[PDB]
Structures are given as C-alpha cells and as structure tokens.
Amino acid sequence: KEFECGSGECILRAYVCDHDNDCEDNSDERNCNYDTCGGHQFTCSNGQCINQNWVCDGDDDCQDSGDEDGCESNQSHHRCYPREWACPGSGRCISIDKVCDGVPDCPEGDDENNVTSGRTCGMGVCSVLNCEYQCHQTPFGGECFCPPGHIINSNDSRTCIDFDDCQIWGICDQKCENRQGRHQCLCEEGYILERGQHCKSSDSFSAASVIFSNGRDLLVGDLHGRNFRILAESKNRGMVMGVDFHYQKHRVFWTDPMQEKVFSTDINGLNTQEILNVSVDTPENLAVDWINNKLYLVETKVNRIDVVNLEGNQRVTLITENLGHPRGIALDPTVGYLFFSDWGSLSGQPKVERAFMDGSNRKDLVTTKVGWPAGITLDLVSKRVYWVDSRYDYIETVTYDGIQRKTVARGGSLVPHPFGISLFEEHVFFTDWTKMAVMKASKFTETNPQVYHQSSLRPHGVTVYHALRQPNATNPCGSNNGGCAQVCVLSHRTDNGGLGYRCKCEFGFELDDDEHRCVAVK
Amino acid sequence: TDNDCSDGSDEKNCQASGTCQPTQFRCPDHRCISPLYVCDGDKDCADGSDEAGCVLNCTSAQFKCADGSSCINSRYRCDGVYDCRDNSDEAGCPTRPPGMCHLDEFQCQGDGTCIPNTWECDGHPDCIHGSDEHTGCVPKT
Ligand SMILES: *[C@@H]1O[C@H](CO)[C@@H](O[C@@H]2O[C@H](CO)[C@@H](O[C@@H]3O[C@H](CO)[C@@H](O)[C@H](O)[C@@H]3O)[C@H](O)[C@H]2NC(C)=O)[C@H](O)[C@H]1NC(C)=O
Ligand SMILES: *[C@@H]1O[C@H](CO)[C@@H](O)[C@H](O)[C@H]1NC(C)=O
Ligand SMILES: *[C@@H]1O[C@H](CO)[C@@H](O)[C@H](O)[C@H]1NC(C)=O
Ligand SMILES: *[C@@H]1O[C@H](CO)[C@@H](O)[C@H](O)[C@H]1NC(C)=O
Ligand SMILES: *[C@H]1O[C@H](CO)[C@H](O)[C@H](O)[C@H]1NC(C)=O
Ligand SMILES: *[C@H]1O[C@H](CO)[C@H](O)[C@H](O)[C@H]1NC(C)=O
Ligand SMILES: *[C@H]1O[C@H](CO)[C@H](O)[C@H](O)[C@H]1NC(C)=O
Ligand SMILES: *[C@H]1O[C@H](CO)[C@H](O)[C@H](O)[C@H]1NC(C)=O
Ligand SMILES: [Ca+2]
Ligand SMILES: [Ca+2]
Ligand SMILES: [Ca+2]
Ligand SMILES: [Ca+2]
Ligand SMILES: [Ca+2]
Ligand SMILES: [Ca+2]
Ligand SMILES: [Ca+2]
C-alpha cells in the first residue's frame, strides 16, 4: 500500500520524495524528480517548491528560512559587517576609516568623544587582544579590525574567520563570485567591467540618454545634463504624464491626462501621432513589452490595467479586480512578470503587486509599511524591483520574489515626495515633487541625492533611453500569432505548458473551450 | 514633505535637525506633521508613532463601535446596514412587536402590513382592501 523504507518503516506516499528525510536510510530521498518550480512557485534552497503566497508570511516553510529572509525593511544590521563598526543608536554601520577620525559620521555621533560618557578615541587594551590582522582606535580604546573576507568569530573579537563578502550590499553592481580572492565581481554580456567593482555599458551601443517629463513638456538629455533638448511640446494646455520607449523602433511614448490622449513619436520628434483617444481619461503611467510589441497602460478614471499594440488597435483589459488606485507599472518580458503598484485598494490595504504578463496569479510582493507606493523600475540583470513611496518617503528594493528588502534612501530631507523612478546601470533617477526636480541617485545607498534637472513645475515619470535597458529574448507569439485568433498576450515562460503565452480576444468576444478561437459575446 | 505652496517655498531649507514647530508633531526620523493627522485612524508616520497609544473620542452626534475600532456618525445607528466591523450599530435596534406595528404605523387589517400614521385617513386607500380609509375618517372640507 504505502512505501516501506529500507530500515523497516512505513511512510505516506505524499510525504515520500518531498525533500523530507523521513527514515534515516533516506530511501525516499535517493531518487530525485524535484523539477524546477513554475512561475507561481518560490524555489527554496533545497529545491522544494512552495506557493508564491507563502513567501514572507511568517512561516519557515522552506525549512531553510529561504522564504523568510529579510522581510523587514532592514531595521538593523546582523552583527554589522567586517571592517565596519556599529552605531548602537540606530544600527548604522561605518568603517574604521570614519570611526574616531574626528567627525560625527552617524546620526548618534557616538563614534567620537562625548562629554556625557567620558569615552575617548585612542589605543587601549588591543595590545592584549592581539588581533589576527590589526588594531585601531575606537572610543572604547584599541579594537580589532580585519581585511576583506575576515570576520570575528563567535564572541571572539581576537579571532577572525573567513567571511563571504558576496552577501554585502553593493559589493559588486551586477554579479559576484566568492571562489577566488575571497570575492570577485563580473558583468552581464553587453556590459564591461571598470575598476574592480563597477560594470559600465560597452561603447558598442549607440548612446545612452534619459527621458523625463518637465511637468509640461517631454525633455531629453545625456547622463550628466550638459545639454537638454525639448523632444515634444504639449499642445492645448497638455501635460506629459508617463513615458516609456522601444529601442528597436526608436519610438518614445507618453501619456497625457489633461488632453485625455496617449501619443507616440520618433526619438527625433518626427511623426507625433495619437495612439488612443477613447475611454482613456487619466493615464497615470505606461510600459512597453518590447519583444511582443505591446503597450501596457494604466487608467485611473476606471481603475484598470490595459494592453494595446504599439499602433493602438487590439485592446483588452487584464486587471480589474480590487485595483483601487493603480499608479506604477513595470515589466520584464524576458522572464515574463508584470509588476505594478497600488496606493489603496477597495480593501483598505495599499500594496505592491506582482502578476504574470497577462494578469494571472496576482501576488502581494510587498505589503508591510508600504504607504503610498508609486512608479516601479526593474534591475533587469540582478532581478530586483525598485519602487518609491510618497507617504513614508523612501526608495526601497526587493527581489522578484519579494525577499531581501533593502532601503536605499529615507527621510523628509532626502526624498520628500518621489513620483517616478528608473534604473540604468548604477544610478536610480527619481522624480521628486517637493524639491521639484529630477534627481540622480546611487542604487545601493545614498547620503544625499544630486540634482539632475531643476524644474519650475512638478516633474513626472522618468526613463533611461538605452539598448541594454531592453535585453533580447525570443517571442513566444512569433510562431504565426501564437495560433490565437485575435490577440496574443505574453505570459510567464512556464505558463500554458511552457508555450509562454495566453490567447485573448478583443472587446466584444469571448474565448471558447479551445482557448484559441474567439466567439461573439452573448 | 507636502508641496502645498505649488512652488516648494514651504519645503525650502528643510533640515533633519528634528526641531519641528510646537504645533506640529514629529515622527521619529521621518518628518514633522500637523495635529489634525495625529490620532485620526490613519498611520501617517512611517512607524505609526502618530497613531499608536491614542484613544477614540466622540461628540453627541456620533456612536461607538463595541470594540472601539470606530466612532461612526449617529445617523448610521439603526439603519439596517452593518457599518461597524463588530456590527455594534444594528444590535439592539427597536423591534416591531410580534405581528403588530410600531406606534408610528397604522396596520392594514386585510394583510397585517404596516403603513405610516400620516397615510391613515388621507383620501388614498394605501392598504390592499382600503382598511386605512375607514368610514371613521373625518371628511375634509
Ligand atoms: C538585440 O539584438 C539586435 C539584433 O541582433 C541587436 O541590434 C543590432 O546589433 C548589432 C550589433 O551586434 C548592430 O550592428 C552594428 O550596426 C552598426 C550600425 O549599422 C554598424 O556600424 C556596426 O558595424 C554593426 O554592424 C545592428 O545595427 C543592430 N540593429 C539591428 C536591427 O540589427 C541589439 O543590439 C541587441 N540588443 C541587446 C541589448 O542585446
Ligand atoms: C561563544 O562562542 C562559542 C564558540 O564555540 C560558543 O560555543 C558559545 O556558546 C558562545 N557563547 C555565547 C554566550 O555566545
Ligand atoms: C481620435 O483619433 C482619431 C485618429 O486620429 C480621430 O479620427 C478621431 O477624431 C479622434 N477622436 C477624438 C475624440 O479626438
Ligand atoms: C474628547 O475627550 C474629552 C476627554 O478627554 C471629552 O471630555 C470631550 O467631551 C471629547 N470631545 C469631543 C469633541 O469628542
Ligand atoms: C523546470 O520545470 C518548469 C516547470 O515547473 C519548467 O518546465 C522549466 O523549463 C524547467 N527547467 C528546466 C531547466 O528544464
Ligand atoms: C529648533 O529650531 C526651532 C525653529 O523654530 C526652534 O528654534 C527650536 O527651539 C530648536 N530646537 C529644538 C530642540 O526644537
Ligand atoms: C424586539 O425586541 C424588543 C426588546 O425590547 C421587544 O421585545 C420587541 O417586542 C421584540 N420584537 C420581536 C419581534 O422580537
Ligand atoms: C373645512 O371647514 C371646516 C369648518 O366647517 C374647517 O374650518 C376646516 O379646517 C376646513 N377645511 C380646510 C382644508 O381648512
Ligand atoms: Ca519524504
Ligand atoms: Ca513562509
Ligand atoms: Ca568619525
Ligand atoms: Ca510626503
Ligand atoms: Ca494619523
Ligand atoms: Ca448602521
Ligand atoms: Ca391612506
């Protein structure tokens, strides 16, 4: 009936071959099917697949806590980091190069002499510690400091053990391996490594430019702001609202809430034409599926998320359930997810939502301490999402599965009212409604964002015009419209039995039982 | 951190010194905030410091949910709609005594249904057999 182990024990079939050792002989664990998880599942360290909703809910389902890793917004450090010191007050970490240098380099300013404590900076008992690498001055006296790949052991300050520097935030901008030199950076194809840390775009691509809304018109400039060119000027008291592009066809799209229309143009400002002017009334934001030739649109008069082709003909609504106040949208067609934000639903909950590129399998990617989430951008090479918040005033990042939440900026002085955001290589460009300027920000950690272009009006959605921002991938719907009768909307690579697409029908039709042929709605 | 002036003049020279005005409440490391947002049922600070630890209050024109989760307007008390999460509003509402009608209602002798007193003897038979326009009704000169 059931499965009997080699050691003489009965185990249920469901729990036979499920990464559970069961009998000490591990009879049920010698065979390995354990196929790769689908789009709707999270993959634990040990290969077990669990549903996406189980991630960061409070239960260690993975048995390795892989699905409960850093769900909090980096409230405090974990034993700080090697060659760094911990400020007791707020968990900020600074290195010895700043500790006792004479300047208060963390909010509490405990790293210097204080009249209320009597702590003085200098040498001390470190002569007795005899640290593995070196001693240095701290307000408690001499203390241990150790090189890269050297962290102090369990309650043993004198002893340094080898550490994995690959886990530290921002050690390498794209990729890192720890098998040589205690760590080593590397870059995705198309990028070229500069120095030993930073990967920059190869000069084999034409150029890189940033496109943003001045609040009235559509601007464009270089990555340093030496020269700015007005791309397309708004007519009839218009307003450029949300912008996105398509590098293959050299077209730039932008929405207009005041004119209640959506436009598109060449990068040269030629052939400006109206894409949609029906039922589109307040298009907050926009996105383009660059490999399927689609334009995903956000609407807020009737809260919904649409998809229409680049020329604006085939239309179908994807998300309508409990959509509340949709503001942000981003997508990764290569893998096949759709990310969108929501600063208040029909249920009171604000959230940052994840979905398939056809609206299936919606998930709360980020739910706690989310306030007023705004536009979203993706790190296409490191598989992370970046979203900004206007209520709690921060810029945060989580992976595609919502794990490992890290804050890159925070405070009313830093990012008082962000709206839009975009990544290129190492910088997040984010619009801010309070300082009234498009600001350039480092994507790991920032003490202070630089001003990139200071406007007289509230700026809006920003994007970075570059080829590497739109990596190549095959088109599942390329094989004769994917066999669909009317519309082929791309989905997850693992959806539809690996076909990677789901058929849809334009308004006025519904899918038959074949899910391929459209029939007139009754 | 709100651009009220529409030109950013009310947000210029804002600094992290944590020295807000006496009127404005201070979130610990987030921003200053107006009193009208302290204890208002909404977490306006990052950590909810402005909402935690406070208690609800009500005028004579409002009603308390049993669990203290809201102060609803008195108009919504005894309306047929559950407003409070714990249904504290529609509990204990006046019940029409078995098979009779309230003091404000005439009862149709033909079927037992109730109509307001204002419809008794008004010239229009509202009840299904014209019970409400009985011969005892005073004639209108
Ligand atoms: C995605 O794939 C497309 C198509 O393979 C890439 O576009 C093409 O990239 C090649 C370079 O590998 C370009 O060739 C170069 O063109 C310039 C201009 O004519 C010429 O001076 C060079 O000598 C070289 O021949 C090509 O023009 C370009 N365009 C097309 C439509 O073929 C694209 O770069 C890929 N993008 C990524 C991010 O992988
Ligand atoms: C200190 O570290 C040693 C390392 O072997 C460990 O056995 C011990 O439990 C630790 N004690 C405390 C209190 O952390
Ligand atoms: C919408 O655009 C089409 C194509 O340019 C045009 O024929 C039509 O009149 C427009 N309608 C409105 C209301 O602008
Ligand atoms: C509010 O609370 C006080 C008690 O602290 C009470 O005396 C007062 O009548 C209440 N006022 C309002 C407007 O509800
Ligand atoms: C893993 O299985 C998934 C479905 O659960 C996909 O088929 C995926 O392509 C598989 N991965 C590999 C490497 O075959
Ligand atoms: C902060 O600056 C304000 C400006 O009005 C007041 O001068 C205040 O006394 C200062 N200090 C503190 C602790 O708030
Ligand atoms: C409703 O409850 C009240 C309690 O005071 C009265 O008893 C009234 O007569 C009840 N009517 C019914 C039908 O339950
Ligand atoms: C009719 O006349 C009587 C007196 O006979 C009363 O005055 C009565 O008020 C009159 N009707 C109306 C509608 O006023
Ligand atoms: Ca098992
Ligand atoms: Ca879990
Ligand atoms: Ca210092
Ligand atoms: Ca704000
Ligand atoms: Ca509040
Ligand atoms: Ca009620
Ligand atoms: Ca009557």
Side-chain angles (χ1 to χ4, degrees), chain B residues 67-136:
Chain B
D67 70 359
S69 59
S70 194
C71 183
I72 76 175
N73 197 49
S74 284
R75 155 153 25 68
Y76 299 128
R77 186 72 202 281
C78 286
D79 55 13
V81 185
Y82 302 113
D83 297 281
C84 290
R85 172 58 84 177
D86 54 355
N87 303 358
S88 175
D89 53 339
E90 301 314 294
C93 290
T95 42
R96 189 176 281 107
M100 283 167 69
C101 298
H102 296 293
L103 306 190
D104 296 351
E105 298 174 320
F106 178 81
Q107 184 168 36
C108 300
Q109 290 146 18
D111 81 348
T113 60
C114 314
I115 70 176
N117 292 343
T118 311
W119 300 14
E120 197 192 336
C121 299
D122 66 353
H124 189 5
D126 304 281
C127 287
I128 74 168
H129 298 315
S131 317
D132 56 308
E133 300 305 306
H134 57 81
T135 68

Coordinates of all heavy atoms in Angstrom, one line a residue, chain B residues 67-136:
Chain B
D67 N -16.1 47.4 20.1 CA -14.7 47.1 20.2 C -13.8 48.3 20.2 O -12.6 48.2 20.3 CB -14.3 46.0 19.2 CG -14.2 46.6 17.7 OD1 -14.5 47.7 17.5 OD2 -13.8 45.8 16.9
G68 N -14.4 49.5 20.1 CA -13.6 50.8 20.0 C -12.9 51.0 18.7 O -12.1 51.9 18.6
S69 N -13.2 50.2 17.6 CA -12.5 50.3 16.3 C -12.9 51.5 15.5 O -12.2 51.9 14.6 CB -12.5 49.0 15.5 OG -13.9 48.6 15.2
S70 N -14.1 52.1 15.8 CA -14.5 53.3 15.1 C -15.6 54.1 15.9 O -16.3 53.6 16.7 CB -15.0 53.0 13.7 OG -15.1 54.2 12.9
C71 N -15.6 55.4 15.6 CA -16.6 56.4 16.0 C -17.5 56.8 14.8 O -17.1 57.7 14.1 CB -15.9 57.5 16.6 SG -17.0 58.8 17.4
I72 N -18.5 56.0 14.5 CA -19.4 56.2 13.3 C -20.3 57.4 13.6 O -20.7 57.7 14.7 CB -20.1 55.0 12.8 CG1 -21.3 54.6 13.7 CG2 -19.2 53.8 12.7 CD1 -22.2 53.5 13.2
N73 N -20.9 58.0 12.5 CA -21.9 59.1 12.7 C -23.2 58.5 13.2 O -23.6 57.4 12.8 CB -22.0 59.9 11.4 CG -22.7 61.2 11.6 OD1 -22.3 62.0 12.5 ND2 -23.6 61.5 10.7
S74 N -23.9 59.2 14.1 CA -25.1 58.7 14.8 C -26.2 58.4 13.7 O -27.1 57.7 14.0 CB -25.6 59.7 15.8 OG -24.8 59.6 17.0
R75 N -26.1 59.1 12.6 CA -27.1 58.8 11.5 C -27.2 57.3 11.1 O -28.2 56.8 10.8 CB -26.9 59.7 10.3 CG -27.4 59.2 9.0 CD -27.7 60.4 8.0 NE -26.9 61.6 8.2 CZ -25.6 61.8 8.0 NH1 -24.9 60.8 7.5 NH2 -25.1 62.9 8.3
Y76 N -26.0 56.7 11.1 CA -25.9 55.3 10.7 C -26.2 54.3 11.8 O -26.1 53.1 11.6 CB -24.4 55.0 10.2 CG -24.0 55.9 9.0 CD1 -22.8 56.6 9.1 CD2 -24.8 56.0 7.9 CE1 -22.5 57.4 8.0 CE2 -24.4 56.7 6.8 CZ -23.3 57.5 6.9 OH -22.9 58.2 5.8
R77 N -26.6 54.8 13.0 CA -27.1 53.9 14.0 C -28.6 53.5 13.7 O -29.4 54.3 13.5 CB -27.1 54.6 15.4 CG -27.5 53.7 16.5 CD -26.4 52.7 16.8 NE -26.9 51.5 17.6 CZ -27.2 51.4 18.9 NH1 -26.9 52.5 19.6 NH2 -27.6 50.3 19.4
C78 N -28.8 52.2 13.7 CA -30.1 51.6 13.5 C -30.6 52.0 12.1 O -31.7 52.7 12.0 CB -31.1 52.0 14.5 SG -30.8 51.1 16.1
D79 N -29.9 51.6 11.0 CA -30.3 51.9 9.7 C -30.5 50.7 8.8 O -31.0 50.8 7.7 CB -29.2 52.8 9.0 CG -27.8 52.1 9.1 OD1 -27.7 50.9 9.4 OD2 -26.8 52.8 8.9
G80 N -30.3 49.5 9.3 CA -30.4 48.2 8.5 C -29.1 47.8 7.8 O -29.0 46.8 7.2
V81 N -28.0 48.6 8.0 CA -26.7 48.4 7.3 C -25.6 48.2 8.4 O -25.5 49.1 9.3 CB -26.3 49.5 6.4 CG1 -25.0 49.2 5.7 CG2 -27.4 49.8 5.4
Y82 N -24.9 47.1 8.4 CA -23.8 46.9 9.3 C -22.6 47.8 8.9 O -21.9 47.6 7.9 CB -23.4 45.5 9.4 CG -24.5 44.6 9.8 CD1 -25.0 43.6 8.9 CD2 -25.0 44.6 11.1 CE1 -26.1 42.8 9.3 CE2 -26.1 43.8 11.5 CZ -26.6 42.9 10.6 OH -27.6 42.1 10.9
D83 N -22.3 48.9 9.7 CA -21.2 49.8 9.5 C -20.0 49.4 10.3 O -18.9 49.1 9.7 CB -21.6 51.2 9.9 CG -22.8 51.7 9.0 OD1 -22.5 52.1 7.9 OD2 -23.9 51.6 9.5
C84 N -20.1 49.3 11.6 CA -19.0 48.8 12.5 C -18.7 47.4 12.1 O -19.5 46.6 11.7 CB -19.4 48.9 13.9 SG -19.6 50.6 14.6
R85 N -17.4 47.1 12.2 CA -16.9 45.7 11.9 C -17.6 44.7 12.8 O -17.8 43.6 12.4 CB -15.4 45.7 12.1 CG -14.7 44.3 12.0 CD -15.0 43.6 10.7 NE -14.1 44.0 9.6 CZ -14.1 43.4 8.4 NH1 -14.9 42.5 8.0 NH2 -13.2 43.9 7.5
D86 N -17.8 45.0 14.1 CA -18.4 44.1 15.1 C -19.9 44.2 15.1 O -20.5 43.7 16.0 CB -17.8 44.4 16.5 CG -18.0 45.9 16.9 OD1 -18.4 46.7 16.1 OD2 -17.6 46.2 18.0
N87 N -20.5 44.9 14.1 CA -22.0 45.0 14.0 C -22.6 45.6 15.2 O -23.8 45.4 15.5 CB -22.6 43.7 13.7 CG -22.0 43.0 12.4 OD1 -21.2 43.6 11.8 ND2 -22.5 41.8 12.1
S88 N -21.9 46.5 15.9 CA -22.4 47.1 17.2 C -23.5 48.1 16.9 O -24.2 48.5 17.9 CB -21.3 47.7 18.0 OG -21.8 48.4 19.1
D89 N -23.7 48.6 15.7 CA -24.7 49.6 15.4 C -26.1 49.1 15.3 O -27.0 49.6 15.9 CB -24.3 50.4 14.2 CG -24.1 49.5 12.9 OD1 -23.8 48.3 13.1 OD2 -24.2 50.0 11.8
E90 N -26.3 48.0 14.5 CA -27.6 47.5 14.3 C -28.1 46.5 15.4 O -29.2 46.0 15.3 CB -27.6 46.7 12.9 CG -27.2 47.6 11.8 CD -28.0 49.0 11.8 OE1 -29.2 49.0 11.6 OE2 -27.3 50.0 12.0
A91 N -27.2 46.2 16.4 CA -27.6 45.4 17.5 C -28.4 46.2 18.5 O -28.0 47.3 18.9 CB -26.4 44.8 18.1
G92 N -29.5 45.7 18.9 CA -30.4 46.3 19.9 C -31.3 47.4 19.4 O -31.9 48.2 20.1
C93 N -31.5 47.4 18.0 CA -32.4 48.3 17.4 C -33.9 47.9 17.7 O -34.1 46.7 17.9 CB -32.2 48.3 15.9 SG -30.6 49.1 15.4
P94 N -34.8 48.9 17.7 CA -36.2 48.6 18.1 C -36.8 47.6 17.1 O -36.8 47.7 15.9 CB -36.9 50.0 18.0 CG -35.8 51.0 18.2 CD -34.6 50.3 17.5
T95 N -37.5 46.6 17.7 CA -38.1 45.5 17.0 C -39.6 45.7 17.1 O -40.2 46.0 18.2 CB -37.7 44.1 17.6 OG1 -37.7 44.2 19.0 CG2 -36.4 43.7 17.1
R96 N -40.3 45.5 15.9 CA -41.7 45.7 15.8 C -42.4 44.5 16.6 O -42.1 43.3 16.2 CB -42.1 45.7 14.3 CG -43.5 46.0 14.0 CD -43.7 46.1 12.5 NE -43.2 47.3 11.9 CZ -42.1 47.5 11.2 NH1 -41.3 46.5 11.0 NH2 -41.9 48.7 10.6
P97 N -43.3 44.7 17.6 CA -43.8 43.6 18.4 C -44.5 42.5 17.6 O -45.1 42.9 16.6 CB -44.7 44.3 19.4 CG -44.2 45.7 19.5 CD -43.7 46.0 18.1
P98 N -44.5 41.2 18.0 CA -44.9 40.2 17.1 C -46.2 40.3 16.4 O -47.3 40.3 17.0 CB -44.9 38.9 18.0 CG -43.9 39.2 19.0 CD -44.0 40.7 19.3
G99 N -46.2 40.5 15.0 CA -47.4 40.6 14.2 C -48.1 41.9 14.4 O -49.2 42.1 13.7
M100 N -47.7 42.8 15.2 CA -48.2 44.2 15.3 C -47.3 45.2 14.5 O -46.5 44.8 13.7 CB -48.3 44.6 16.8 CG -49.5 43.9 17.4 SD -49.5 44.0 19.2 CE -49.8 45.8 19.5
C101 N -47.5 46.5 14.7 CA -46.7 47.6 14.1 C -46.3 48.6 15.1 O -46.9 48.6 16.2 CB -47.6 48.2 13.0 SG -48.1 47.1 11.6
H102 N -45.3 49.5 14.8 CA -44.8 50.5 15.7 C -45.9 51.5 16.0 O -46.9 51.6 15.3 CB -43.6 51.2 15.1 CG -42.4 50.4 14.9 ND1 -41.6 49.9 15.9 CD2 -41.8 50.1 13.8 CE1 -40.6 49.2 15.4 NE2 -40.7 49.3 14.1
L103 N -45.7 52.4 17.0 CA -46.6 53.5 17.4 C -46.8 54.4 16.2 O -47.9 55.1 16.1 CB -46.1 54.2 18.6 CG -45.8 53.3 19.8 CD1 -45.5 54.1 21.0 CD2 -46.9 52.3 20.1
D104 N -45.8 54.6 15.3 CA -45.9 55.5 14.2 C -46.6 54.9 13.0 O -46.7 55.5 11.9 CB -44.5 55.9 13.8 CG -43.7 56.7 14.8 OD1 -44.3 57.1 15.8 OD2 -42.4 56.9 14.5
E105 N -47.2 53.7 13.1 CA -47.8 53.0 12.0 C -49.2 52.5 12.2 O -49.6 51.9 13.2 CB -46.9 51.7 11.7 CG -45.5 52.0 11.3 CD -44.5 50.8 11.2 OE1 -44.6 49.9 12.0 OE2 -43.7 50.8 10.3
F106 N -50.0 52.7 11.2 CA -51.3 52.0 11.0 C -51.1 50.6 10.5 O -50.2 50.4 9.8 CB -52.2 52.8 10.0 CG -53.5 52.3 9.7 CD1 -54.6 52.5 10.6 CD2 -53.7 51.5 8.6 CE1 -55.8 52.0 10.3 CE2 -55.0 51.0 8.3 CZ -56.0 51.2 9.2
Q107 N -52.0 49.6 10.9 CA -51.9 48.3 10.4 C -53.0 47.9 9.5 O -54.2 48.0 9.9 CB -51.8 47.3 11.6 CG -51.6 45.9 11.1 CD -51.2 44.9 12.2 OE1 -51.7 45.0 13.3 NE2 -50.3 44.0 11.9
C108 N -52.7 47.4 8.3 CA -53.7 47.0 7.3 C -54.5 45.8 7.9 O -53.9 44.7 7.9 CB -53.1 46.7 6.0 SG -52.3 48.0 5.2
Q109 N -55.7 45.9 8.2 CA -56.5 44.7 8.7 C -56.6 43.6 7.7 O -56.7 42.4 8.1 CB -57.9 45.2 9.2 CG -57.7 46.1 10.5 CD -58.8 47.2 10.5 OE1 -59.8 47.1 9.9 NE2 -58.5 48.1 11.4
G110 N -56.4 43.9 6.4 CA -56.5 42.9 5.3 C -55.3 42.0 5.2 O -55.4 40.9 4.7
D111 N -54.1 42.4 5.7 CA -52.9 41.5 5.5 C -51.8 41.7 6.6 O -50.7 41.1 6.5 CB -52.3 41.8 4.1 CG -51.4 43.0 3.9 OD1 -51.4 43.9 4.8 OD2 -50.7 43.1 2.9
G112 N -52.1 42.6 7.6 CA -51.1 42.8 8.7 C -49.9 43.6 8.4 O -49.2 43.9 9.3
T113 N -49.8 44.2 7.2 CA -48.6 45.0 6.9 C -48.8 46.4 7.4 O -50.0 46.9 7.7 CB -48.4 45.1 5.3 OG1 -49.5 45.6 4.7 CG2 -48.0 43.8 4.8
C114 N -47.7 47.2 7.6 CA -47.8 48.5 8.3 C -47.6 49.6 7.3 O -46.8 49.5 6.4 CB -46.6 48.5 9.3 SG -46.5 47.0 10.4
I115 N -48.3 50.7 7.5 CA -48.1 52.0 6.8 C -48.0 53.2 7.8 O -48.6 53.1 8.8 CB -49.2 52.2 5.7 CG1 -50.6 52.5 6.3 CG2 -49.2 51.0 4.8 CD1 -51.7 52.8 5.4
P116 N -47.4 54.3 7.5 CA -47.2 55.4 8.5 C -48.6 56.0 8.9 O -49.5 56.0 8.1 CB -46.4 56.4 7.8 CG -45.6 55.6 6.7 CD -46.6 54.6 6.2
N117 N -48.7 56.5 10.1 CA -49.9 57.2 10.6 C -50.3 58.3 9.6 O -51.5 58.5 9.4 CB -49.7 57.8 12.0 CG -49.5 56.7 13.0 OD1 -49.9 55.5 12.8 ND2 -49.0 57.1 14.2
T118 N -49.4 59.0 9.0 CA -49.6 60.1 8.0 C -50.5 59.6 6.9 O -51.1 60.4 6.2 CB -48.3 60.7 7.6 OG1 -47.6 61.0 8.8 CG2 -48.5 62.0 6.8
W119 N -50.5 58.3 6.6 CA -51.3 57.8 5.5 C -52.7 57.3 5.9 O -53.5 57.0 5.1 CB -50.5 56.6 4.8 CG -49.2 56.9 4.2 CD1 -48.4 58.0 4.3 CD2 -48.5 56.0 3.3 NE1 -47.2 57.8 3.7 CE2 -47.3 56.6 2.9 CE3 -48.8 54.8 2.7 CZ2 -46.3 56.1 2.1 CZ3 -47.9 54.2 1.8 CH2 -46.7 54.8 1.5
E120 N -52.9 57.3 7.3 CA -54.3 57.0 7.7 C -55.2 58.2 7.4 O -54.9 59.3 7.8 CB -54.3 56.6 9.1 CG -55.6 55.8 9.5 CD -55.9 55.7 11.0 OE1 -55.0 55.6 11.7 OE2 -57.1 55.6 11.3
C121 N -56.4 57.9 6.8 CA -57.4 58.9 6.5 C -56.9 60.0 5.6 O -57.3 61.2 5.9 CB -58.0 59.4 7.8 SG -58.8 58.2 8.9
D122 N -56.1 59.7 4.6 CA -55.6 60.8 3.7 C -56.2 60.9 2.4 O -55.8 61.6 1.5 CB -54.1 60.6 3.6 CG -53.6 59.4 2.9 OD1 -54.4 58.5 2.6 OD2 -52.4 59.3 2.7
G123 N -57.3 60.1 2.1 CA -58.1 60.2 0.9 C -57.6 59.1 -0.1 O -58.3 58.9 -1.1
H124 N -56.5 58.5 0.1 CA -56.0 57.4 -0.8 C -55.9 56.1 0.0 O -55.2 56.0 1.0 CB -54.6 57.8 -1.3 CG -54.1 56.9 -2.4 ND1 -54.8 55.9 -3.0 CD2 -52.9 56.9 -3.1 CE1 -54.1 55.3 -3.9 NE2 -52.9 55.9 -4.0
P125 N -56.6 55.1 -0.5 CA -56.5 53.7 0.1 C -55.2 53.1 -0.2 O -55.0 52.6 -1.3 CB -57.7 53.0 -0.5 CG -57.9 53.6 -1.8 CD -57.6 55.1 -1.6
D126 N -54.3 53.1 0.8 CA -53.0 52.5 0.7 C -53.1 51.0 0.9 O -52.3 50.3 0.3 CB -52.0 53.3 1.6 CG -51.9 54.7 1.3 OD1 -51.2 55.1 0.3 OD2 -52.5 55.5 2.1
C127 N -53.9 50.6 1.9 CA -54.0 49.2 2.2 C -54.8 48.3 1.2 O -55.7 48.9 0.5 CB -54.7 49.0 3.6 SG -53.6 49.5 5.0
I128 N -54.5 47.0 1.1 CA -54.9 46.3 -0.1 C -56.5 46.1 -0.2 O -57.0 46.0 -1.3 CB -54.2 44.9 -0.1 CG1 -54.8 43.9 0.9 CG2 -52.7 45.0 0.0 CD1 -54.3 42.4 0.6
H129 N -57.2 46.2 0.9 CA -58.7 46.3 0.9 C -59.3 47.6 1.4 O -60.5 47.7 1.6 CB -59.3 45.1 1.8 CG -58.9 43.8 1.3 ND1 -59.0 43.3 0.0 CD2 -58.6 42.7 2.0 CE1 -58.6 42.0 0.0 NE2 -58.4 41.6 1.2
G130 N -58.4 48.7 1.4 CA -58.9 50.0 1.8 C -59.3 50.2 3.2 O -60.3 50.9 3.5
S131 N -58.6 49.5 4.1 CA -58.8 49.5 5.5 C -58.4 50.9 6.1 O -58.9 51.3 7.2 CB -58.0 48.4 6.2 OG -58.1 47.2 5.5
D132 N -57.5 51.5 5.5 CA -56.9 52.8 6.0 C -57.8 54.0 5.8 O -57.6 55.0 6.4 CB -55.5 53.1 5.5 CG -55.4 53.1 3.9 OD1 -55.9 52.1 3.3 OD2 -54.8 54.0 3.4
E133 N -58.8 53.9 4.9 CA -59.8 54.9 4.6 C -61.2 54.6 5.1 O -62.2 54.8 4.4 CB -59.8 55.2 3.1 CG -58.4 55.7 2.6 CD -57.8 56.8 3.3 OE1 -58.5 57.9 3.4 OE2 -56.7 56.7 3.8
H134 N -61.2 54.0 6.3 CA -62.5 53.6 7.0 C -63.5 54.8 7.2 O -63.1 55.9 7.1 CB -62.1 53.0 8.4 CG -61.4 53.9 9.3 ND1 -61.9 54.9 10.0 CD2 -60.0 53.9 9.4 CE1 -60.9 55.5 10.7 NE2 -59.7 54.9 10.3
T135 N -64.7 54.4 7.4 CA -65.8 55.4 7.5 C -65.6 56.3 8.7 O -66.3 57.4 8.8 CB -67.2 54.8 7.5 OG1 -67.4 54.0 8.7 CG2 -67.4 53.9 6.3
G136 N -64.8 56.0 9.7 CA -64.5 56.8 10.8 C -63.6 58.0 10.5 O -63.4 58.9 11.4

